[PDB]
Design a binder for this molecule. Sequence first.
Ligand SMILES: Nc1cc(CN(CC2CCNCC2)S(=O)(=O)c2ccc(S(=O)(=O)N(Cc3ccc(Cl)cc3)C3CCCC3)cc2)ccc1C(=O)O
Length: 145
Amino acid sequence: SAKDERAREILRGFKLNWMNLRDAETGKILWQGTEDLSVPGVEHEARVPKKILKCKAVSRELNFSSTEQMEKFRLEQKVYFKGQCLEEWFFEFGFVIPNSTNTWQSLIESQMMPASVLTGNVIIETKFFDDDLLVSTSRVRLFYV
Ligand SMILES: Nc1cc(CN(CC2CCNCC2)S(=O)(=O)c2ccc(S(=O)(=O)N(Cc3ccc(Cl)cc3)C3CCCC3)cc2)ccc1C(=O)O
């Protein structure tokens, strides 16, 4: 279908360039990377400091480029522990100019399991939408260090 073709064009033109996480209260950087975690079909890995689990809120900056125009770029993210969804998050970016590079700031705000239990057992599944069109699904396995 035209929508399936369109999804592939958007993916083809998309790159996640860099990204970081900060304690929202203090602004202190907890993690940063330049690996494109959005790439589908391979299991990505990331190592994050265990103190992140003590943050009431985490600020994420995500820098991306897109050759394709998007009407309503957004993300759905599911936190899975041993295959069980503990949490679902929704973030909206909105309009994306074709051939632009953009920085997107988001706030991520139950009782947390210990880092030692969680480590290597947490998968973040991220879906990349333009409105209702699914562009891609990626997975990142988290280790708490
Ligand atoms: N309920 C739980 C939720 C989590 C997930 N954490 C969310 C934090 C937990 C501490 N309070 C603030 C929210 S987290 O700190 O581990 C966290 C997870 C994902 C992310 S992320 O979605 O921003 N990102 C994944 C990501 C981001 C963007 C894209 Cl495109 C793809 C993947 C990763 C984090 C490390 C490398 C980047 C940020 C923080 C863990 C355990 C439990 C539990 O019940 O025990």
